[PDB]
Structure formats: C-alpha cells, structure tokens
Design a protein around this nucleic acid. Sequence first.
RNA 1: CGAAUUGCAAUGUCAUUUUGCGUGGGGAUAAAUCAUUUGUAUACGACUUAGA
RNA 2: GCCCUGAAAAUGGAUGGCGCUCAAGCGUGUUACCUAUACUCUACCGUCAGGGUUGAUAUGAUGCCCUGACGAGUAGGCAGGCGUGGAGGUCAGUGACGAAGCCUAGACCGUAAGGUCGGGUCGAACGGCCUCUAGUGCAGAUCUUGGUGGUAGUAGCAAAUA
RNA 3: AGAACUGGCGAUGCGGGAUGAACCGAACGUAGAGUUAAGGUGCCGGAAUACACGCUCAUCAGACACCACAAAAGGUGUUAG
RNA 4: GAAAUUGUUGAAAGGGAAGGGCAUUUGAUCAGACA
Lengths: 61, 197, 106, 48, 58, 171, 127
Amino acid sequence: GIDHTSKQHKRSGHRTAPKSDNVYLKLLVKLYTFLARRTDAPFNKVVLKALFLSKINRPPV
Amino acid sequence: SQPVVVIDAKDHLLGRLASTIAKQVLNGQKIVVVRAEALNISGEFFRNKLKYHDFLRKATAFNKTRGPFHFRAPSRILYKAIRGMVSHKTARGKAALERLKIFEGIPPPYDKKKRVVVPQALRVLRLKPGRKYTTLGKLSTSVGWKYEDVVAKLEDKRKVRSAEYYAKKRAFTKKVSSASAAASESDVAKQLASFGY
Amino acid sequence: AESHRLYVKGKHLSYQRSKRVNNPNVSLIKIEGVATPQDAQFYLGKRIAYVYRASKEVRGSKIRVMWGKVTRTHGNSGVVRATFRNNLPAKTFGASVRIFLYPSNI
Amino acid sequence: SHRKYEAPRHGHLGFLPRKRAASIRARVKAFPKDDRSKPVALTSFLGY
Amino acid sequence: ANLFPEQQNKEIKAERVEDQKVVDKALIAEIKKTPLLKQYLSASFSLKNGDKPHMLKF
Amino acid sequence: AHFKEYQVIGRRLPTESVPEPKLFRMRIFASNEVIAKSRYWYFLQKLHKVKKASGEIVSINQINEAHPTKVKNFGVWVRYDSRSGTHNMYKEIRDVSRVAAVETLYQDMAARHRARFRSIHILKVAEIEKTADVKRQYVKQFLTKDLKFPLPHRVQKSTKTFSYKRPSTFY
Amino acid sequence: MASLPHPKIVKKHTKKFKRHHSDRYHRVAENWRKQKGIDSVVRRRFRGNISQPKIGYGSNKKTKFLSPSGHKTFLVANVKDLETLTMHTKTYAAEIAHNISAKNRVVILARAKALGIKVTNPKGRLA
RNA sequence: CGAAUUGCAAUGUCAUUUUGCGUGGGGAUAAAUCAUUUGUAUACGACUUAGA
RNA sequence: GCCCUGAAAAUGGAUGGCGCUCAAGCGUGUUACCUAUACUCUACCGUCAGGGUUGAUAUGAUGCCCUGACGAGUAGGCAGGCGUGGAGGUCAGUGACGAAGCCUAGACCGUAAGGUCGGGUCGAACGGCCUCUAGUGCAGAUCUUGGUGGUAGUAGCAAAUA
RNA sequence: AGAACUGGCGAUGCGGGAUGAACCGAACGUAGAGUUAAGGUGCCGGAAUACACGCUCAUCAGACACCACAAAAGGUGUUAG
RNA sequence: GAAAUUGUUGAAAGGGAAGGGCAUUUGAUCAGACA
C-alpha cells in the first residue's frame, strides 16, 4: 500500500518501432539498431529515431 | 483425563460452572452434573425472581406454544445457561449437548461413583463473604417446580446409605493403615523413602 | 503390562480462525498436562496422528491415519498449532489425536 | 387505535384446545387428598 | 512377486551369532556389576496416566 | 505506570545581555526522561517566561531512594482538576519509596475521583519523621503497638480445573 | 518418450470458473461472463462470493501447455503431420484428430511406434 | 528354552453396537386393518359399537 | 467519585446473547496473547521502465536474456485476443472403414473468452493456417414467435318442480 | 434550508464497531511463512476465569467513541476531602 | 430429433427453504504408471 507520486505504468510517449510493414524499412532499422547499440556515435540514434516517424513528422526536403 | 466427569453442583455458581462445562463438552468430555437443586447464583432471591419473571413475560403472542419455553426446574435452568454458551443450532453444539446429562439429586449410577468440584465456580472462593446469594431450589419452587419435597426425601436416604458405607470403609482404612505401618520401618520402605515414596 | 503406549493424547479443538473466518490449513491441538507455552515448546516438531475407521479395507486394514506435526505454540494456556499433509475434516472438533515423541531431543 | 366501546371477551381461554377428547371416558386428573387414618374406602365411581 | 519367491527372504545365518555372543557376554559382565538393570533392560517403556514428559526426566 | 524520579535542571537560553541566566530545578515523577523533560517545560512555562525553543535542559538525573528498605509515612500535598472546578488535597501513604507512594496515589485518586494523570499536579512529598503528626486514620491504624491481624478467608489458586475435594479456608 | 527435464507442474485455481447464477437458471450457461452490474457483488468482490479470473492465476511459462506427462500436445490428421515430430519426441505428444478413420488410425499408430512418438488417444475407434 | 532377516520410522488391528447365514438346546402357538354393522360420533379420515 | 429517586407507552425482548457481583462492571496501570487482501521475505503471472544480444546460431530482433519497480476501480478510453456466417489462397487437409450436429457429475489445455479428445447416437458433407468481408456473440427490453410448467386432478360442471 | 477548508462515499472491496454507503485501522495481482494495526482474550469466539490499587449491591445496575437518548433538584447510602 | 417440462430404474441427501465460496474426511470415478 503505497502513496504514489507519479502515475504508474506510464508508457513512454515515443515509438520504438515504425507503424509500417515495409520490409526494407524494417531492415534499415535492423541495421541502425545494431549501429546505435554497438557504436558511440549519436548520428546513428538520431537516424534511427527518425526512421520511425510519420509522414507528417518526416516531411520532404 | 477421565472418560466421564461427575460434578457435584453444590455451592457452585451458575455461569461460572456452565462456561467451564460448555468448553469441556465442546472439547469432547462427557460431563454429568448432579445435585443441581443446590446450585447457587449471586444476588438476592427477590432480584433473581424478578429476572425470572421478566423471562416469563416473554412469550410469542400469536401462539405461546411457539416461544420461549420457560422451564422451571434447576437442571433445565442450567441447561439453558449452557445452551446459551453453545451453538446449539449446529451439529457441533447438538453433539456437544448430547454429551451432557443433568439431574436433580444423585441417582443410582452416580451415587456409587466419585464426584468432583470446579473451584473456579465455587461460591466460597469467588464471592465476598457477606454478599447475598440465591438457591436454585427455592427459586424453582417459587416459580412452579413441584418436586423439591421429593428429592429431599430421596437425598436423605442416599445420605444414610452413603454414611454407612463410609462407616465401614473408615474401619477398613484404619485396619489397612495399622497393617501397613508395621512395614514402614522395613528396609523395603526406608529404601523407598530415599526416592520420595 | 496393561499399558503399551508411547504417545500423549490430545484433542483437536478447532481450526485457526479469526472471528467469522477460519484457516483450515492450521489446526489447534490441546495436549494433556500442558498449561503454558513453555513446557509446550518440548512438543514442537513432534508428530501427530489422527486415527479413524473406514469400511473399505485398504492395504489390509480398516483403520486409517492422517499424519502431521506440531509447528508452534498458541497464547498462554498450552495450546499448539499443527499442520497435516491433508488438513482435518472439521467433524473432529473434540476428537482425540495422538502425539508421538519420534523426533526427540532428550 | 383503541376500541370505541369496551366490552368483555367472548369465551374462556382456559377451556382452550376446544377439540375432541382423546377418549370417550374422561379421566380424573385429580383425586382428593389422603387422610391416612380413615377406613379404606373408594374415592370415586363410574356409572352411565 | 508377492508370494514368497524365497530368494534371500527369511534365512538367518550362523555367522552373526558369534559376533552377537561375543559382545553381550562382555556387556552383561558390566551390567551385573550393578543390580536391577538386567530387569530394567528386560522391561519395556510405557507412559502411564499422570506422566508429563516435559516435566519428567530420563 | 512504573514511575521513576528525575531531577531536571533548565535554563533560559543565554544572550549577550545576560550570558549566565538562572538555573531552575524540578524534582519530577515520571516513567522516562522524555516525559520528564516534557513536564519540566509544562511547569516552568506556567511560572517563568520560557519554552523549549527559548530554553535548554542542562542536566537530567535519576534520583534513587536512599533507604528503600525502610517503611515511611509520606505525606502528599496535591491539586487536581475535576469536571467542575479545581481543588487541593492532602493524603498520607505508608510505602517504602517516594515513587511507589506516587504510583499508588495516582491510582486511588483515579478510583475515588476519576482524575487522570493529565489532571494531577503533585506539589509536595514529605517523609514524616515522627508518629505524632500523622492525622489520617487509615495510616494511624498501622502505627499501633504489637500490631497483628489474620487473613480469615483464604483462596488457593488452581492450575487444574477439576478438584476432588472441597477446599478449606482456614489459614 | 521419457521426457524428464520438466519441474513440478503447479496449477493455480484448478477449478473451472463458472458463471454467476449458472446453477439457478438454465439459460445462464456456465461459460464465464463478467458481471458488469452496479449493485453486484462479484464485481465488487464481497466475501463468500465467487472468484473471478485475473492474470494473477496465470501459469508459469515453463509449465504452460504441458500435460502431466510433461509433453505438450500436437494434433495430427495424417503421417505428414507426424513426421514433423521426428526430432521433437521428448516434448510433443501426437493427439489424433476426432475425424480420422479407424483405417488410418492404425497406420498412424504403427508409424509412431517406429518413430518413438507418444500418442495420447490410441484406444480410439479400435474395437 | 526361544523371541534376530517387520532388514534405520510408516495404525503395524484386539475395541462396539446392529444385521444375515449355519450348526444344536431348549421354549412359545396370535392379533390388527379392510369390507359389513352401530350412532353416545361424524365434512372425508377419525371416534364409539356388534358380528363365526 | 459511585449508587438511588427524577426517568411514564403501548406484539415478547435485547451490554449482540448467555450470563457476571473482592466482576465476566467502573477508573487507572503492567506484561503476555489472538488476527486483516496492511507491513517484511520468497516463488509465480502480467504490465511499465532501463540495459545486453544480428557474435550470428534455428538467417528469426516478430524474438532471446538480465535488472528493478508496480498491480484497487463505476462512467469512459486504448491495446492484445477467443468465437460465428460467407469470400480469395493453402494443407496435393478429414470423411460412408462414417462428415456435421446432439448427449456425456468421462479426460486434457488456457487466467478467461474457448479449444481439444474418448464413448453413445446419427447419416453426408466439414475443417486448420495467411488474409477479406459482415444482417457476427444476449439473462433481461410489461421484447417478438413457438412451445411448456407449479397452480391442479384443484375452482368447479348447482337457474328452468322429476 | 444556504455556504468555507480538508477527507471520504458515489466509483470501494478487506479486519473491527453484532448489524449499517460515510466511523476506526487499512486500500486489493495468485499463494506460503512471519509480525501487527483498530478491536479484543468467561463461553458462544481464535486469544490471560492474568497481575496490581481502589469504588459499587442497583425491587427497569453497569458494560467498545460516531451510537442509537438524558437534564434541573434531592438522599447521613457510601467513599475521600 | 436439443432444451424447458415429464415417467421408470439406479446412486445420494433431507428437523420452518434450496443453491454457492475456502478446507478436508467418506463413497464413486479418472489418471499416469517412472513399465
């Protein structure tokens, strides 16, 4: 019996994988998880957390 | 430890005896209260009579042959007190009360047997000397028990027949003590006394 | 010669319970002669048997046994607790079990 | 609420279980007291 | 096989008995140096009615 | 409770204007140092301008009895608050120790007046020296010569519930 | 078919979780349905009333889907389904479907007795 | 004189009523209900009566 | 301070009951003891979070592994799943040596929705997996239709002279 | 009848108060062992007919706060002052 | 050829309800047999 300060079982609001079923995107993510894990470069993580993004948060350049 | 326990209810207090019983007869001892007419209950006679009349007042209006059955005898008074301490609406309590037998006076099977005493219910030990107490025989006779003058005619008879037994046994006892005292100086006994015996 | 026994007789009083709630996993035993928790601490670990009858002879006997042990004490009057393999049936409230001396420390 | 006008009970509550008797010959629930001095003599009779 | 196949079931030998006779005769030698002990061992233990094991000694 | 006697010295907190203030002493009855130090600040805060925060406690010392194997007549001056009004009282006790006299005074006060610990202030406890200043009869009846009395009605305790002979009260 | 690496299958609440008032009314079946009522007592978890399903009663992941023999069950209708279990003999038991003919049950039984596979319903449609 | 090998513990059974069957030893030879009838009774049952 | 009087209401009755009087009452104090889904320890389920692992083995990372914490819940929101009728693919699927359905205080699996098996009955079509689709899941609505009961062998079948 | 602050019920079970929507304790995954809360230990009922100082005898005593009712005025009835 | 409802047989229980939860005895039944 605990007096909780914070809401319990609070999902992180982010997405740790895409919503799509694209095989090639899944493979790119397979690659960049490896790199982000086994590399100390933050470029890899940025690219990774960008590969997850919606069509509106992934706009055109 | 005994299989059956015969209890002389003379100079005993009612609830203080009945609780002891109601626990022992639930734990599984067969108990036989005897000489229930000489039981005692605290407080004065007029007070206890008022309480019994308050109990008699309570009867089912629409048909009084349904309601509190006011038993007037002492055996049944004590049975009421015990049954109130027991869950008689269950098999546990019914079985328990089947292990009980209460009597006025001391009948044949229990006159030739040994009677015991509950000391945590005795009037002389529990009550302050000078307090007024009440006798269940006089009470029952006041509320409509018609057999006080009979158990008396039987108890004196039992007592005569018991006192002659004691008069014989006492002589046998002194003879046995005088026969055993002629061996106490012996090496069979001053070797026992080294072990407390 | 008339006696052959090596046990102490006791009574199955009840289950462990609150008011209005019972725990049949735990049973209460009243041992004879015992009047305190000290002098009941001797009977801890000791085995217990409830010996009863049944009409179907199994393995060559009509009598049947439910084994258990003494675990710990109860408050201020020499009652103890017991835990059997298969808990007791509640019709034994006021029935004689027999406590052995088999695990001894004398 | 109380009765407007009081009046006694109908019947007697002491002759109750106003049922059929269990035998056609009514039974004597009470005999006189015994004087242990007088001559031996019957106490009652039954006729038709 | 519960009908006495008789493959080393009940036959007591005659080798153990010499090793049994050699100790008990040397042991009764020490028992009989004190009385009432042959009888003690011959008897069998039993609890009477008023016996409180937590109170009595051994 | 199982009381004890304490000696509590206290001191309003020092300042540059008076860096050696006055030590006040109290001889208090209580079960432990904690509530002793609480009662010190209850009584001192009735008389002088100080609190726990504006003060300190210097020394706290248990006072044991000098002759605890001597019977003494303790006169006691006390005041108590009732349901309606506040009063004073004097009672004599015949116990061996100051603390025991207090322990049996709180009790019979709670009996005869239904006054609790939170109502009673024990003003003065005095060992009376001579058998001529005692004025209470329930003490004077024990200060007689060749005092003897019996205990007529004895009650033996029982470890077993069933007994096989009627008891006797004979002493 | 020994299959003895498994440890002490325990089952929390081996009872069946019957519906409330499935015994009072014949229309109310025994299949469990939550009581969404407002003045209910099973929903509010009073004392003496029945117990409801929760994930707390969930079984261990090491002893899930195992029969007391230590195997988990695989349904076969033919030999092609059996031959999948030629490796996994000490973990999987080949229950035969309820629609197979007695003519083919013997084929399956005979093939499995050779492959060492264990069957759970081998006295079926036999006579 | 023997009690061992129930192999290091597993109630290691004698209690106590009821009931059936057979052996052999004697002992005893009936009422109730229905149906009929009566009316001191009665909604029907029941009650009270009579009948070889 | 206690006790009494004051203090009277209507079925028979309520310190919960019995019952209790150096209390089993009142005031106060000292230990011992009982036990809640609470607290501590452990195991298990699930969720949340953090981290390790594409060495590369079953290429799969849908996962596997370690660590810690947590779990109430109406209206209500989201997720993961069970089930039904039909559709597209697929198991070269089951089947007259007996499909489906029905009965089964007979068994197994799952927290559960539910699935699976044996037996009896029966007689011709039916399923598992990946997906699509919907007239898709009932205890109720003084629900609709159909059928059936306790009431109950009961009320009662008695106007009109026979 | 109408407001303020907090807490709770509603939406909430569990131990206790006999019983109770709100009081006391304490908030819930499935189980085991241990310890406690509030309340209690004559028997019903698991647990001391435990210890200690006192008061009370009531011809409707008294007995777990919320709670299920009680005043003014009197008593040499008693206890202490 | 379901169920409601009903008859026969069999098992079991039953002092002003029945049903249900936890725990176990007794009876039946199933189990796997580690064979």
